[PDB]
Design a protein around this ligand. Structure first.
Ligand SMILES: Nc1ncnc2c1ncn2[C@@H]1O[C@H](COP(=O)(O)OP(=O)(O)NP(=O)(O)O)[C@@H](O)[C@H]1O
Ligand SMILES: CC(=O)N[C@@H]1[C@@H](O)[C@@H](O)[C@@H](CO)O[C@@H]1O
Ligand SMILES: [Mn+2]
Length: 448
């Protein structure tokens, strides 16, 4: 995988979104864009909250995305604008990139992406340009609009710079740079954005970053349903809490199994080190970790550390004062979840006479797990997932981080309309509810 992001040559006018964008850029900057860039958002089919644990996921890119009209400038001046009034213009000319985790203002996600590229190539000077941002992904809704902006911003930067990177590399870089926002997430979102391929789903693996086509089942529609509960990951610690929780769990797991925990960072590492299977890993966990919650002193104790080292050498800023750590539950979640993913696939590769039904299950399982073990669901998500089921839903589960956001659901061909209607009907009574297909990845667009 040395292939880079593609370059579509276009006649602007044939693309309404584009020409519009072109028109407003001009209005905003007195010039026309030199080029454009898009990076889709995505739907995680299954395998939630395990990317950061080193485990493989199965998402697919959505068609919604972030489109940026770009114009390079000779100055050290970065001017960002957004077609959406909710997103104020932003400018800077500083080589020193200042990202505020205090109020993740939209523009900061753009800076993460730009900043990562600059650093990748050891650059200090700000890359001057004018950009008009245009995203159609519902914000803070589980669809990775943050990552779309991130990746898009990165691609743009690289293009302006006129340097080259593989899609992989891009994904890898944008996975790390997004953290500048304050989130300690994995790499599923960026990887799918850069690696997506139309008409197929992907099994994204990590270390090494790899993607593998996954042919979806033949008779069901994947339907995104937005709970309508907004979750801004960067605005709230829940996420990082879970990140810590697992990290801690893994360390303790290693300790127990007598490995080198000090080096351990992720849950899968433990499974790796032991040479055991997922199922076995579940038994380990069951032995190693007590259900009742762990505490900071107890933790310290177990590891032969100091609260200060905890705090210091291990904890996160936004997790320092946590009293309660649910190591057992998070691990139970993680380990099973990886197993489902590997399963779901395998199935997909077999095509059994009861495919959906099966897969459906796998999916309900993810949900409950996330719900009960990982505790990253919500009451709203909870109902939505039922109702869905209530109408045809062969598979329903929250998607993305959770705590609001969307849900994905395998509705079989024929119930769609009802689903659609009844759901619409129940929950609701295109924007919040709609069907999906495996979209393609990030691309450069040249008016040619
Ligand atoms: N069109 C857009 N323009 C500017 N900023 C955007 C746009 N779309 C998304 N964002 C930014 O991205 C933020 C949402 O980030 P985030 O919390 O990660 O939600 P998400 O990416 O949709 N879901 P998830 O996959 O679970 O991480 C918003 O608060 C905005 O700051
Ligand atoms: C950008 C970011 O942190 N992405 C993460 C992704 O890595 C994954 O953990 C997901 C839950 O499965 O929640 C987030 O959106
Ligand atoms: Mn996000």
């Amino acid at each position: 995988a040395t292939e880079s992001p593609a370059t579509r040559r276009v006649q602007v006018a044939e693309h309404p979104r584009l020409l519009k964008l072109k028109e407003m850029f001009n209005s905003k900057f007195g010039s026309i864009p030199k080029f454009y860039v898009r990076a889709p958002g995505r739907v995680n089919i299954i395998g939630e909250h395990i990317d950061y644990c080193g485990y493989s996921v199965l998402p697919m890119a959505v068609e919604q995305d972030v489109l940026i009209a770009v114009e390079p400038v000779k100055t050290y001046a970065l001017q960002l604008a957004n077609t959406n009034p909710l997103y104020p213009d932003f400018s800077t000319s500083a080589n020193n990139i200042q990202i505020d985790k205090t109020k993740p203002l939209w523009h900061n996600y753009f800076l993460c992406g730009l900043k990562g590229i600059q650093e990748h190539f050891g650059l200090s000077n700000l890359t001057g340009m004018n950009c008009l941002v245009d995203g159609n992904i519902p914000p803070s809704s589980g669809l990775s609009s943050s990552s779309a902006l991130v990746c898009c911003a990165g691609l743009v930067t690289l293009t302006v710079l006129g340097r080259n990177l593989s899609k992989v590399e891009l994904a890898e870089i944008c996975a790390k740079s997004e953290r500048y926002i304050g989130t300690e997430g994995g790499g599923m979102d960026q990887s799918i954005s850069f690696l997506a391929e139309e008409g197929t789903a992907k099994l994204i693996e990590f270390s090494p970053l790899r993607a593998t086509d996954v042919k979806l089942p033949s008779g069901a529609v994947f339907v995104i349903a937005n709970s309508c509960v907004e979750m801004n990951k960067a605005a709230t610690s829940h996420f990082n809490i879970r990140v810590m929780e697992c990290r801690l769990a893994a360390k303790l797991l290693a300790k127990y199994k007598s490995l080198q925990w000090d080096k351990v960072l992720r849950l899968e590492e433990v499974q790796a080190k032991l040479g055991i299977s997922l199922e076995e890993m579940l038994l380990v966990t069951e032995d190693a970790l007590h259900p009742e919650p762990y505490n900071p002193e107890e933790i310290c104790r177990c590891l032969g550390i100091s609260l200060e080292e905890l705090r210091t050498q291990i904890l996160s800023p936004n997790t320092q004062d946590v009293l309660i750590f649910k190591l057992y539950q998070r691990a139970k979640h993680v380990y099973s979840e990886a197993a489902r993913v590997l399963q779901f696939k395998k199935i997909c590769e077999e095509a059994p006479e009861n495919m959906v039904q099966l897969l459906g299950e796998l999916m309900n399982q993810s949900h409950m797990s996330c719900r009960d073990m990982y505790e990253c669901s919500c009451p709203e998500l909870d109902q939505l997932v039922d109702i869905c089921r209530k109408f045809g839903a062969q598979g329903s589960r929250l998607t993305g981080a959770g705590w609001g956001g969307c849900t994905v659901s395998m509705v079989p061909a024929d119930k769609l309309p009802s689903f659609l209607a009844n759901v619409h009907k129940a929950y609701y009574q295109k924007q919040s509810l709609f069907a999906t297909k495996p979209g393609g990845g990030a691309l450069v667009l040249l008016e040619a």
